[PDB]
Amino acid sequence: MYKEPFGVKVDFETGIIEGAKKSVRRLSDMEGYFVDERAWKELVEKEDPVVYEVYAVEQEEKEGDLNFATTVLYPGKVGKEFFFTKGHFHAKLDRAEVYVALKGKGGMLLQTPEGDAKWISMEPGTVVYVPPYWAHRTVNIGDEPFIFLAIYPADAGHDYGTIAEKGFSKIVIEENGEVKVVDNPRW
Amino acid sequence: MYKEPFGVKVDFETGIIEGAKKSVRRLSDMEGYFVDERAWKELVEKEDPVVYEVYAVEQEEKEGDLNFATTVLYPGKVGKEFFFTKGHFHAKLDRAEVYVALKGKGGMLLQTPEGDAKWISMEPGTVVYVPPYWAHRTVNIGDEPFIFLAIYPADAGHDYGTIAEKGFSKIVIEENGEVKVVDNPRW
Ligand SMILES: O=C(O)[C@@H](O)[C@H](O)[C@H](O)COP(=O)(O)O
Ligand SMILES: O=C(O)[C@@H](O)[C@H](O)[C@H](O)COP(=O)(O)O
Ligand code: NI
Ligand code: NI
What does the entry's cofactor note say about binding and number (chains A, B)? Predict the structure, then answer.
């Protein structure tokens, strides 16, 4: 039986999607992710702020089909490091992804199975192409929420494990009032 | 070898993607698409207007990779029928598509291989899920350009022929100042 086509309203101001399933990631949910463990533990104990929320509209895992989701990435820093999404590779490594930036100032960090990294800046209107085999993470480098829509293959799945253990070969920090992408000492 | 990640600017007011492949379809490229053949002949002679332009960023046709494109669908009528895109099924029938409406007033007409139809209104912010197996055509029901962004599997391909010969089982016309979706009499 064919699936029913539908339309859902996406609010470009809030990132809210009608009919989507919500996910909330708090700072506590990201242990071992930031370089400055002291600032992390401090921020968690003090307020454990929400780092980001995802509104996902997903299908059964089937070749050729597509999922889409917005993310609202809140502004913040853990020590010198800007708030970011956990980041992942796809379970089916060769699945690509397309991001559309809607609001705020941010960017995407990407890296290969081997660690070679790239940084792509994102402002409203920017569409980012995430090629097959690249892990990807988004970072809010500004003062307001960074909101974007992502469209990805239904069967792409997720590999958070690799990233959670080694992180990205680079980190994005504020140094002298400036955003800088630098080597991860933890790597 | 890994492909290079990249970002491109999409302009939400004009639908133009900087550096993208541009395609232009004029009414003369749409012989046998509109119900009112005489009105089609007449409008082509008087003016041969651009019905739509597409700005496409495509990858090689491999499983799991993704293409994206904007379309600028111009306002107009052929007789009583609103300007529309040619419409197609995918070559790999079971490939889905996701559409994001950016500007203007329109909608999508979809139908199964058996001719069952569905109409989904589109205003700015509407995201439409085009399921596996469903042919899809966009229609402009207002007086300004209807602009939207579409993301689709790189291997989906196109099947235009099926629609080129028999059309869609429904049409979208203006009747008594109102938009109406009704049976295609030539189907
Ligand atoms: O599909 C995606 O890759 C995004 O929707 C991310 O899942 C989302 O931004 C949250 O990031 P992560 O999944 O890395 O926690
Ligand atoms: O991926 C899509 O289906 C869209 O980009 C359409 O191709 C585009 O709107 C043009 O319509 P058609 O391809 O039916 O002429
Ligand atoms: Ni992903
Ligand atoms: Ni299509």
Answer: Binds 1 Fe cation per subunit.
* Cα–Cα dist B54/B70, whole Å: 6
User: What is the extent of the structural domain holding B176?
Assistant: 1-187
How many Å apart are CA A59 and CA A21, to the nearest integer?
A: 12
Number of structural domains (chain A) is: 1
The CATH number of the domain where A93 resides is what? Answer: 2.60.120.10
Residue type, A186: R
Mutate to test the interface with A, among B14, B66, B148 (most CBs of A within 10 A): B66
Length of chain B, in residues: 187
What is the experimental resolution, given in Å to one decimal place?
1.7
Number of alpha carbons in the 13 Å side-chain half-sphere of residue A29: 15
Residues 6+ apart with CB under 8 A from B99: B108, B122, B127, B128, B130, B138, B148, B149, B150
What was the structure determination method?
A: X-ray
The size of chain A, in residues, is 187
Distance CA A151, CA A147 (A): 14
Give the residue among B8, B95, B174 at the shortest CA–CA distance from A127: B8
In Å, how far are A125, B70, B75, B80 from B147, measured between CA atoms?
Answer: 14, 7, 11, 21
A149 CB neighbours in chain B (<8 A) are 100, 127
Q: Encoding tokens for residue B24?
A: 């232009």
